[PDB]
Symmetry: D2
Subunit: 410 residues, 4 copies
């Protein structure tokens, strides 16, 4: 019997050819990932139909021979920034994928700031699951962190120098229950540039506004104190920081503060992991043990093409709970420019150490079926992009990000 | 969680508005029928996507306020001729539905004979399940029984008087396995009219051609002998007869000869059931017991609107096996112009007598959910159209046909 | 040879059935109007393709039997608020039409404020004519007068009582040169309600902001003085006022302040026409002569259905020039609930008095061909909606608005 | 102002991505050709909308990187076999284009013979211009010359060895009046192969059938006599012959018999031009003078890549008139594998000799704008495919065929 993506691509009508190309590229990947996780055929159908109706129409142009049609400049290759499978204890695995919503004419004089794509995506997604998307947090943070179209157009000279004029990124957690949780990431770089204000200060002022406007405890003291220090700024690129929240009931949602850091040593990794020792506990220690393990497993190996390793690029988030003052970190090792073989082997060794044999097989299956380049090309550099590490009191929490449009790069 | 047809209508893109209207009308019905049978959500998705891609684009215009857009004249209301659920022993239930493939411009000077709709439908269906549709029998019988476009256009004056210029009807058995078996019905009335030849003779000459060209035993002696008799012609409308075959491997397919008969008594029913006593056996006797039961259960009641019952309209088929000389009948009681309440009650009493309680509940559920008019309007005349009765050696075989576009008539 | 709308509807593919229905209704009307004006076939093709790509996808649902699908509440019937032909001296005639951009799911929990429709329309329109749409004025006035989605959702309780939650209306002047000038109307009623601020004050503060931010003289002293008076408020509904500007180069654009007034006498008409005598000159006098002529020609006749005339509903604008302190009025007689025969006859008598015989014939032709109900039904109340009167130094300036979806009401 | 194809591609919605790609390739070419001829913008719009609705959906897959999606094998590159501009005396120029209608799944088990594409194209074309397409001749010749799907499938083993299983080709004359005359070409090679019958005999038996069935004089004596001779068969490939007729009123239509011949000398050219001297007159002499001129102008030059010229590939038709016994020839010099520069220069010298300066400029303009490769690449071999020469009593009749998808080959 045909797999859901085969049959769907055979039947589905596509409003645009770019949607058909994006489907051909991604539906195999997303469906193979869901199927290896264990999603049910009806759930695969629902989620692939979501990807067809809400998402792909908001992926933007499909890159051609020379990528002449990609008018929306970005460091990331066109398409989903990632397609990830989270792995937790108890054979828990959830498929999720992130997209920067891009319009068909973003970057051009008609949509120079790509304002409508994310809103269209959210509208479609709420129409497909009425009641699943709550815009309370989005409605509070969109004026504070994001720059609407009119503002960006009036204040263009202030942001025209910026290469990636990103203002809102959307991730869709794709639950085994066919429910899609929308997550919104706001990089306020445009906001800071227009207002000429510290990133830290505007982000945390927005969080505090939401605190007082909602009555929810989002403890941001430690994060602000650490991120304001000068030592942190030596390594921490704050121009690359962004805020995230789940588009749910604020009492059931979260606030996460992300930032980028190019560090050289594990002590700087701990600087970003524990907020200068401010955060403490057994979970911090265990998570950093796992982080050091994967550090010396991945960044120990030689870089492709005999290029020396200047420094280890990492991202980091700190997750604030609405119920409690808890701040919990999640470290993201960037492995885009590394051997997919070494990344895969490090993941496998980590899972094997954690006793996650089923996750080992799921990961190998997803790599083999959805990412054939990894085995076909020993020198592959286009599948994995990030390895997230966290240790919740449930246990380890490791997500493995992958470029779902690696077929385009190979 | 939404039902497959809700979600699909929310996501699916439709090439034409008529397809959207037909979907709104039928997908509820077809999906409720499949779901009450027990089809799996993935199977419902696949079958509704088939109905979206292959079928509905070949249903023709959707009837408007005044049915001004129905340029393809037909006795049947626009849409599927039926949407049926077969009921056999052992809680066996299969959903199937019949369509006369109509084009968007059938009946107009561009498609005055509606030649391409059925071929397009078969092409799409084979593209969606390559290897499921075998055209051996279709390729043999299409020149013999059906009239292509060029012929009909050259020989128009011979057939212009005909009201329903039907030449090929397509039924889709919708298996629980997501496989759709295509069945083709050929009314050669146009063929006979152009060639000025007996219906009986051309149909059975085609069957005999196929016999000698295939080496398969399709015993048509008894059927021909009975249908040639003059007594039969007093009741039997032969202008309304047609041939059917399953579009499968001829060694795994069948040949069925249908005809219409307006009879008054059960002895004429037996005339058509047993081919003037030529067919015999316990199955014939039991099947006719069931037929007489439903005869005196349905045609005993008074007709709606105090209109007297002139005669009992029936159809009948005789099924020839490729493996054996067997001829087996299937009698179709026409109950389109009768109280849907009385038809439903007769079905329920029949099933209860057969011990088919589960089928009783399935039938009541399908009526309540997919056909609300039956309970809302005591004087309903727009749900049921046919009751097929047969007795295979497996046991009783009762199909219950229903106008799936009854929402349009009420 | 077929007319452009016939052929186009025959060839064009429509993304949705509602677009096909809207086309069937409006393309005849718009095309007949353009053709009676004298637009060239290529211009008709271009403008109807604009109406197909940019507009109709932003008209919203097509009203069904019971208008159950119109989830966006509005006093106006669904569709274009008007389809107008302006008539000036020298046989100058320009086709234009106004639309309140509505989304497919406006009024529902997904788009409770209809935020994206107007922006999508402008985006498409700029993509179709890059460089024709300038958003300087839109970018300045959108935050001041319009309420974005997040704000409206946070401040819902303040505006939930409002029936027509309109915030931006788009008119497309459809030039004989195939160029479409976009005009944006901002009713800040939601803005005033959320901020609990005077309509007059916020509108004119926005205008003054634009003055100081642009260096363009938009004299709003007389308008503000008149509209602030208490006598004016006795007749003037200020809850119904709105601002308009042409989406062009601000030095080549305009600012117009509209308001609604239910007056009884011609002295109140002059109150609104001359801003309490503040505006003066020969043009004012001549324009008011024409206004009184049409007043006593139209509002003199009896209302349909023997309903007595409580008061004469009028709208009024005052047009400020970027080049000069000029304020010029345009009075809009509302004739929606009046005999289309009497309105047509008044228009004809006016044109005949002005010597506009060619416009008389153009108007009669448009009425006969695009609005057959006017002749078919003597008691017609569904074609004309407004009669605008102005007297520029060029000469008289009379626009005649018509419900282009009158086919739906009759 | 944008050109019709620019604006149309900006607005039009495309049912499939292949249609969008084909549009991007061809609409520029077709529109530039029409515009250089002098077609009016409304006519360009109508004809490009025809190419969008009827044709491109019946061009088949768009060739990808490796032409893996071209499942319908053919000697010709995918797309229109040609896009031609006929040039006659008096600055008379018409654009016409030929297409072999291919389905989206032609060559696959679903449409192994590509049966529905041509019929769909004719249906759409008649729907767009009801009364323009007359199927009398098509209805007579389709059973005689063409092989339907069922026959080809039953008789597959007889034709499976054939590489190009072509059975019907459609050309659209695109008149300056926006009317599209459909022309159907029937290569009966499949018919002859299945029936194992001479091409000559079946073609001319069909023509004679039509004669007796219509009362129209189609003199085929000379053509049959010549084509039956053995000397002709030494050069004449009869496996490559085909019949053509205009899909109009038979009394206003024509019958043309085409064949392919690989000849070496001008005396063989005259053999095919005059039917072994059977045809005579001043027109024959003048036409052959022009043919010899272009022979020694084009085939005199060296072949690209230093490949020696084995023989001169030509096609030839003989046009029979329904009104008269006239047989008139049209010789087609095949110049696909020759320098587009030399072909263009020969065309220019010919036109200059004929006094057709305006045609010279039209041809150079079409080459420069629609075929930039000719000037950009001196060694171009992908623009011109045929040069037709005829001499009607009106005067010379020279058509210049060009691969409209040359952008794909370069
Ligand atoms: C796109 C960037 C401007 C910005 N920075 C990131 O690296 C990022 C990636 C990401 C991966 N999964 C979720 N978000 N998110 C952002 O918002
Ligand atoms: C449509 C008629 C011309 C013709 N006669 C019928 O009554 C018929 C109905 C049917 C119901 N289920 C399957 N076939 N089939 C036919 O071919
Ligand atoms: C409530 C709104 C519809 C608001 N009110 C109006 O009467 C109006 C109509 C209109 C006709 N032509 C142009 N505008 N414009 C608006 O913005
Ligand atoms: C496609 C071939 C099977 C066959 N042979 C040809 O060369 C031909 C080309 C053509 C150019 N313009 C019109 N016809 N036509 C045919 O039917
Ligand atoms: C890997 C990057 C840069 C972003 C991470 S977002 P996430 O997807 O890690 O969020 P969760 O906390 O896993 O929901
Ligand atoms: C009820 C009518 C008129 C047609 C019957 S066809 P069928 O659907 O009975 O065929 P099967 O023998 O059930 O496959
Ligand atoms: C008739 C109503 C209510 C609105 C008028 S807008 P307009 O269309 O009169 O604008 P112009 O000044 O004619 O451009
Ligand atoms: C040259 C190719 C091979 C076929 C020629 S068809 P045609 O376009 O020349 O037909 P006309 O006689 O020009 O109508």
């Amino acid at each position: 019997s045909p797999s859901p993506w085969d049959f769907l691509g055979r039947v589905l009508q596509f409003q645009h050819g770019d949607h058909k190309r994006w489907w051909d590229v991604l539906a195999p990947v997303f469906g193979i990932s869901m199927a290896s996780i264990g999603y049910k055929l009806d759930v695969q159908y629902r989620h692939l139909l979501v990807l067809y109706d809400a998402v792909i129409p908001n992926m933007g142009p499909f890159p051609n021979s020379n990528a002449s049609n990609i008018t929306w400049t970005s460091p990331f290759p066109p398409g989903p920034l990632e397609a990830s499978v989270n792995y937790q204890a108890g054979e828990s695995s959830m498929f999720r994928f992130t997209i920067e919503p891009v319009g068909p004419h973003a970057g051009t004089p008609a949509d120079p700031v790509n304002e409508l794509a994310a809103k269209q995506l959210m509208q479609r997604l709420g129409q497909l699951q009425p009641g699943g998307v709550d815009s309370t947090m989005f409605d509070h943070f969109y004026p504070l962190l994001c720059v609407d179209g009119p503002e960006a157009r009036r204040q263009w000279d202030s942001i025209a120098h910026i290469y990636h004029k990103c203002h809102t990124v959307t991730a869709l957690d794709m639950q085994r229950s066919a429910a899609c949780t929308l997550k919104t990431y706001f990089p306020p770089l445009l906001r800071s540039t227009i207002m000429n204000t510290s990133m830290v200060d505007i982000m945390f002022d927005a969080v505090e506004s939401f605190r007082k406007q909602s009555g929810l405890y989002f403890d941001y003291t430690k994060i602000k104190e650490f991120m304001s220090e000068e030592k942190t700024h030596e390594t921490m690129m704050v121009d690359r920081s962004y805020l995230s929240f789940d588009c749910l009931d604020p009492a059931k949602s979260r606030i996460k503060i992300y930032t980028e850091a190019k560090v050289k040593t594990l002590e700087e990794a701990y600087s970003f992991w524990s907020l200068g020792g401010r955060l403490s506990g057994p979970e911090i220690d265990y998570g950093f043990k796992i982080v050091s393990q994967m550090w010396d497993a991945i960044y120990s190996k030689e870089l492709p093409g005999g290029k020396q390793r200047e420094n280890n690029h990492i991202q980091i988030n700190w997750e604030m709970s609405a119920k409690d003052s808890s701040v919990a970190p999640k470290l993201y090792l960037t492995v885009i420019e590394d051997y997919d073989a070494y990344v895969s082997s490090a993941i496998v060794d980590l899972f094997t150490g954690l006793g996650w044999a089923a996750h080992v097989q799921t990961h190998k299956k997803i790599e083999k079926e959805a990412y054939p380049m990894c085995d076909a090309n020993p020198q592959s550099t286009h599948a994995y992009v990030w390895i997230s590490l966290a240790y919740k009191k449930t246990g380890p929490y490791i997500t493995v990000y992958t470029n779902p449009g690696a077929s385009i790069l190979e």
